[PDB]
Amino acid sequence: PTYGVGHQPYRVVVLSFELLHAPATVCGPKKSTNLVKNKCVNFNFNGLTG
Amino acid sequence: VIRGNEVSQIAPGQTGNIADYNYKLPDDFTGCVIAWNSNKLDSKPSGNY
Amino acid sequence: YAWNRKRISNCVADYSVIYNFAPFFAFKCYGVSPTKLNDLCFTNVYADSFVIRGNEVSQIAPGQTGNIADYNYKLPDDFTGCVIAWNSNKLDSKPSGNY
């Protein structure tokens, strides 16, 4: 503990994400919206807007 | 748990000792790297061996 | 204002032992990278030593003006070197004042 800041301990936790290639299993807390058809609409299909 | 000098080595494209012999990140890495100092928990006057 | 320059030549140098000597965070480099510093051969290297405050470490960059960089230690616009900086409170400070 008397060492300098360059030799101080560091606890490193890294996260590795996986892009959408599978059915999505982890998503955020947003509530889903009922589907609409045959209308001009904004959509969000598992993070794919448009 | 790594030393404070090896924080910059945990990145895509880095080379050295930890990045070549302990833990290597891919070049197509997509994630977040979190590092925080732990001088209270992981340090001993006799040494955390 | 009275910084010393030491000439280093006619030797081989290993740059992986720098981190075990001083408690610094990381290198800052202009024109080169510290990872590939051991992969090529040079002609001459020099070492400069001085002590400044923590508010004036930003004046050790090329193309920067101020107080240290204007009248004490000015860097070239085509500087191709690496600058190491670390904190030293147990050696460069006194309770009575290191003047």
Curated annotation (Swiss-Prot), chain A:
It comes from Severe acute respiratory syndrome coronavirus 2 (2019-nCoV). Binds to host ACE2. RBD also interacts with the N-linked glycan on 'Asn-90' of ACE2. Cleavage of S generates a polybasic C-terminal sequence on S1 that binds to host Neuropilin-1 (NRP1) and Neuropilin-2 (NRP2) receptors. Interacts with host integrin alpha-5/beta-1 (ITGA5:ITGB1) and with ACE2 in complex with integrin alpha-5/beta-1 (ITGA5:ITGB1). May interact via cytoplasmic c-terminus with M protein. May interact (via N-terminus) with host bilirubin and biliverdin, thereby preventing antibody binding to the SARS-CoV-2 spike NTD via an allosteric mechanism. The gene is S. Attaches the virion to the cell membrane by interacting with host receptor, initiating the infection. The major receptor is host ACE2. When S2/S2' has been cleaved, binding to the receptor triggers direct fusion at the cell membrane. When S2/S2' has not been cleaved, binding to the receptor results in internalization of the virus by endocytosis using host TFRC and GRM2 and leading to fusion of the virion membrane with the host endosomal membrane. Alternatively, may use NRP1/NRP2 and integrin as entry receptors. Residues 21-43 are annotated as: Disordered. It comes from the Viruses. Changing residue 21 to P: Increased resistance to human covalescent sera neutralization. This is Spike protein S1.
